[PDB]
Ligand SMILES: [Br-]
Ligand SMILES: [Br-]
Ligand SMILES: [Br-]
Ligand SMILES: [Br-]
């Protein structure tokens with residue numbers, strides 16, 4: 001059942017904010033040459049900078065963000081994998097300026113791209129458990145998780161859900177394996193083996209606007225939870241019903257994903273990924289994706305939808321804290337736009353976030 005099939009043609013129920021929700025938000029380093037309409041109040045910052053981090057930790061507490069997801073490039077690109085950790089260690093060092101109640105923890109958004117896996121080249125291609133032999137790519141796969149487990153074993157600031165370090169895997173539907181559960185159980189056993197029985201909580205991303213069971217064979221027995229990429233990624237052509245009735249579309253799709261993934265045949269948590277806006281035309285004006293302007297009324301309705309789809313994890317993911325390249329950020333802007341006269345969203349979206357996901 002896809003998006004048209006799952007839209008209920010009637011008002012979305014009100015979901016009250018009664019417990020605190022566990023909110024994670026993607027953290028990024030934007031390209032600052034793009035033509036933004038407003039600018040960050042912390043000013044420009046690169047992957048090498050650290051002065052922005054305290055400001056962002058403050059912003060994050062203003063928003064009720066419990067953890068940031070930072071990119072992790074696979075060890076196959078050695079330099080990029082090194083940088084991924086350097087960035088997080090610089091973040092972690094800035095956490096030492098904060099009390100325990102103000103700490104905003106971290107976790108990784110794992111990118112296996114460098115392994116060169118696709119459908120024709122699975123991660124387990126020459127893996128044979130019975131000759132104790134692993135595909136070269138599976139070795140690297142494992143090493144990427146060992147390195148994460150090592151960071152978490154040694155750093156209480158690595159975000160844990162119920163004692164388990166959280167890992168998000170980008171494009172998890174394309175992590176081609178002849179046997180996804182066997183690959184993941186081998187990796188989990190290797191982590192348990194090396195880190196005193198550590199268990200991980202792995203979130204797998206699927207593409208937006210797609211059925212929640214389309215990629216069961218990639219997720220069932222493999223990951224702990226599934227989410228979609230933001231539904232604010234949408235071709236402006238032939239999407240008339242979806243843009244017009246968006247909040248109802250996402251409500252329909254997410255609550256259905258939460259029900260359907262949660263059946264005993266599958267046994268997977270669903271975690272909604274939300275966005276306040278998007279603009280894919282920033283990186284390239286030929287991107288046909290529709291621009292979602294920031295709209296408070298809409299964003300609150302989306303947050304309500306997400307609350308309608310949350311499960312036992314109590315978890316919601318925000319695309320994004322500061323993914324300015326695609327217009328999804330909530331990072332505090334200056335009070336005026338680049339024109340020097342029009343009011344900008346400022347800190348409005350941090351405050352909305354705390355209202356929509358933390359108990360008053
Ligand atoms: Br700096
Ligand atoms: Br809070
Ligand atoms: Br021991
Ligand atoms: Br389905």
Ligand SMILES: [Br-]
Pocket residue numbers: 031283325
């Ligand atoms: Br770019």
